[PDB]
Amino acid sequence: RTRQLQQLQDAVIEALATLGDLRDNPRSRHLPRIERYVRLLAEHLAAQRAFADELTPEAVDLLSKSALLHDIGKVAVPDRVLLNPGQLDAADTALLQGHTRAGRDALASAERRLGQPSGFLRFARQIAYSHHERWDGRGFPEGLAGERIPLAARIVALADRYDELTSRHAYRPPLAHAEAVLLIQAGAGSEFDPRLVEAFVAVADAFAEVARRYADSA
Amino acid sequence: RTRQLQQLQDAVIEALATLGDLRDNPRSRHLPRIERYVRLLAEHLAAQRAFADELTPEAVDLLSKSALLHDIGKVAVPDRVLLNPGQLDAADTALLQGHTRAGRDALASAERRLGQPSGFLRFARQIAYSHHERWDGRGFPEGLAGERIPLAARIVALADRYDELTSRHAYRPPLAHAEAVLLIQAGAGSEFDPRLVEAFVAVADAFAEVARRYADS
Numbered sequence: 001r002t003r004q005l006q007q008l009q010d011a012v013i014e015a016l017a018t019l020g021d022l023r024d025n026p027r028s029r030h031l032p033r034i035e036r037y038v039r040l041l042a043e044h045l046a047a048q049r050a051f052a053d054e055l056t057p058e059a060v061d062l063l064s065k066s067a068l069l070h071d072i073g074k075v076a077v078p079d080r081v082l083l084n085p086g087q088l089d090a091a092d093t094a095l096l097q098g099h100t101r102a103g104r105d106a107l108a109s110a111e112r113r114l115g116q117p118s119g120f121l122r123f124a125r126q127i128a129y130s131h132h133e134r135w136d137g138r139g140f141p142e143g144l145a146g147e148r149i150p151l152a153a154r155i156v157a158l159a160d161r162y163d164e165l166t167s168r169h170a171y172r173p174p175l176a177h178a179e180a181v182l183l184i185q186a187g188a189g190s191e192f193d194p195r196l197v198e199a200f201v202a203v204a205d206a207f208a209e210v211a212r213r214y215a216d217s218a
Numbered sequence: 219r220t221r222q223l224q225q226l227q228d229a230v231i232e233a234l235a236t237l238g239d240l241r242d243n244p245r246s247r248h249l250p251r252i253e254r255y256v257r258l259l260a261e262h263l264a265a266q267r268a269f270a271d272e273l274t275p276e277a278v279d280l281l282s283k284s285a286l287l288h289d290i291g292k293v294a295v296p297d298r299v300l301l302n303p304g305q306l307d308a309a310d311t312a313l314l315q316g317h318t319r320a321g322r323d324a325l326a327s328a329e330r331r332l333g334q335p336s337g338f339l340r341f342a343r344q345i346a347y348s349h350h351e352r353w354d355g356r357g358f359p360e361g362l363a364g365e366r367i368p369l370a371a372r373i374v375a376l377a378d379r380y381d382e383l384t385s386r387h388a389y390r391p392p393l394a395h396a397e398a399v400l401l402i403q404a405g406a407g408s409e410f411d412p413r414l415v416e417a418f419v420a421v422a423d424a425f426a427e428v429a430r431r432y433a434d435s
């Protein structure tokens with residue numbers, strides 16, 4: 001019926017999120033992988049009582065598409081910080097962390113424009129802000145902890161770590177799947193909601209399939 | 219229902235275009251000004267028979283909204299170039315110019331994803347690529363001339379120059395409206411299509427109003 005506009009939105013968002021990665025992550029399939037990793041975890045969690053209210057099939061879809069915007073705030077990070085492979089002094093680390101606030105601000109201003117609130121923009125905004133929060137309260141930028149982190153950001157944090165481990169960086173090749181799994185498991189209760197780790201372990205073979213099929217070009 | 223999605227698209231595009239200005243033009247109302255300067259010109263041209271085919275009222279609306287993405291490509295320009303206030307050596311100048319190509323490529327890859335015709339994406343793409351072309355063939359990145367520059371990019375080039383003259387820079391304060399008008403008239407047949415200059419002259423008072431009301435804080 002109104003697919004024409006929904007497809008146009010998806011294409012535009014995909015294109016521009018991709019530009020937003022150009023400075024620190026060019027030539028990557030990060031974004032379509034993250035989307036699928038998020039969807040898989042969200043689908044599995046949706047079958048369980050603790051999450052089914054929040055994760056309706058409509059919510060799962062919006063959540064997954066909004067995960068594409070997690071890092072659009074990186075334009076607030078100067079080249080010298082973003083392209084520095086080494087360790088950062090504390091004021092530069094603060095600039096790198098501010099990617100979350102900048103993404104949050106832009107998306108919240110977009111929300112205030114709408115008469116009928118948008119689930120899409122609300123998930124996108126929660127994710128952009130809170131995707132580097134840690135279950136134990138030691139992440140950034142607010143140090144939220146436990147169920148005070150929005151569910152969408154908790155899902156994305158795990159997807160994002162899996163993706164980072166199983167893709168290329170200047171310092172190394174991707175880690176093998178089995179090792180990434182042990183590394184994500186190790187973060188249960190510190191980095192990640194232990195229930196999301198449990199969901200991840202049940203879908204991990206599907207994660208390995210996405211990582212292979214949507215692998216970066218050589 | 220269709221409104222809900224159209225309002226969502228407008229909100230998201232504006233947010234992302236605004237993030238695209240953050241590095242070299244933070245705290246600015248460039249984008250809402252530009253959109254209105256485009257719409258004003260386009261609405262006047264649409265009256266004319268010569269442009270009326272291409273500028274239907276639907277096209278006017280898409281054209282205007284797509285103009286927001288003109289400089290989205292500036293993420294391909296390194297900080298050291300983009301933040302340099304002086305004259306640029308020729309290889310840095312080439313990197314600055316490549317904002318047009320990088321915007322083009324992102325929007326074309328979106329047209330490929332979508333795989334059906336979108337007036338919105340087509341306008342956006344043409345604008346991002348050609349908004350610094352000059353009627354006399356001396357612009358960049360291709361040196362297109364005359365009617366070989368897409369109409370949308372010809373409209374945006376004029377709007378963009380007006381905005382740049384009547385807003386702040388490190389070198390100077392804004393030019394007064396009356397002087398900016400003369401200056402734009404002076405570019406007829408070199409920078410700009412002379413028929414767009416005619417249209418600009420007929421809507422100039424409205425341009426002055428947008429410039430004042432949407433002035434930077």
Ligand SMILES: [Cl-]
Nearest residue numbers: 036209210213
């Ligand atoms: Cl797959």
Ligand SMILES: [Cl-]
Nearest residue numbers: 427428431432
């Ligand atoms: Cl006005």
Ligand code: NI
Nearest residue numbers: 030070071160
């Ligand atoms: Ni990312």
Ligand code: NI
Nearest residue numbers: 070071099131
């Ligand atoms: Ni991030």
Ligand code: NI
Nearest residue numbers: 248288289378
């Ligand atoms: Ni601009």
Ligand code: NI
Nearest residue numbers: 288289349350
């Ligand atoms: Ni430009």
